[PDB]
Symmetry: C2
Subunit: 182 residues, 2 copies
């Protein structure tokens, strides 16, 4: 069982949902979904690029010692003020930078410069929305069954199917399997 | 039941190994040969191809009849900076290599997994049913590269039980462990990939 992530901590973790439409059907759908997964959902709206950096920096300083993971959802990446480099956001949660989340998975769900390749990180981005509505539907049905890569794979098939009648992208640097149950 | 790729075709598929060494990477190629050979793949071997010879190679393969084949694997072993894939004369753009195997372009490999294992010794094309196992670690090693030898060991042990993503996940954990004393996975697969039927 050392091939899986430790998801039996007192909590599950934070679920920062940053909404930059200026997607609300998705933001609420993501909220209700991750709340059932016992996460600590925090919905943000129309944050400038300086505010996004400020937020993610303060979260890195938080105590995630009781939290299992960290989920960040970006819907726009572009801030309302300008374009943010994804690296500027991820650097805070780098293994050595954030000691509290070291060894824990950091999920970045993005709905729209190289991509940060750091351990225990994950990017599932597509370019309400079909990607989010299907992801919530898969997390609602297969979170207590399938591993997260298998869940994201069903999303890839479901979205591609919808396009038949372009496909989401999974960037995995996880070192262990991820199950949303214990 | 349509959650796993159809892997019971008469043939498992092709496995192109491009060894641009210009040793360590020679052990990589020798290990990748034995590994995919036991996985019942048709392994074709190339050595020190120019960046044009690579493109026309993938061009010819895409024009073959993979109707009786389950999948397609392409292992790229190159070196140098400013890029991820290199010929003996310059860097190759993955955008040009993968375009031949798009669903509309390649009828034979439509709905089938195309695996591209890339090792780059020192813009990603997003297409359905494609996967890129990308590593970057900086010649005389008796074992060879870390990512390759870990991939071959994890495949020769867990292909009978684990799905490809779970195999690559354990490869990530092993290469990252050696760093203490990380490979990148880009997956657009629509189904699960098991190397058995």
């Amino acid at each position: 069982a050392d091939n899986s992530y430790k998801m039996d901590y007192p909590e599950m973790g934070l679920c920062i949902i940053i909404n930059n439409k200026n997607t609300d059907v998705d933001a609420a759908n993501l909220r209700e979904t991750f709340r059932n997964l016992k996460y600590e959902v925090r919905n943000k709206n129309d944050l400038t690029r300086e505010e996004i950096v400020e937020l993610m920096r303060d979260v890195s300083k938080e105590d995630h010692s009781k939290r299992s993971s960290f989920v960040c959802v970006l819907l726009s990446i572009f801030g309302t003020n300008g374009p943010v480099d994804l690296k500027k956001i991820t650097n805070f949660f780098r293994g050595d930078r954030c000691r509290s989340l070291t060894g824990k998975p950091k999920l970045f769900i993005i709905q729209a410069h190289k991509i940060p390749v750091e351990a225990d990180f994950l990017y599932a981005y597509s370019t309400g929305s079909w990607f989010i509505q299907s992801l919530c539907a898969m997390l609602k049905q297969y979170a207590d069954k399938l591993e997260f890569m298998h869940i994201l794979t069903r999303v890839n098939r479901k979205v591609a199917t919808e396009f038949e009648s372009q496909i989401p992208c999974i960037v995995s640097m996880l070192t262990k399997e991820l199950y949303f149950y214990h």
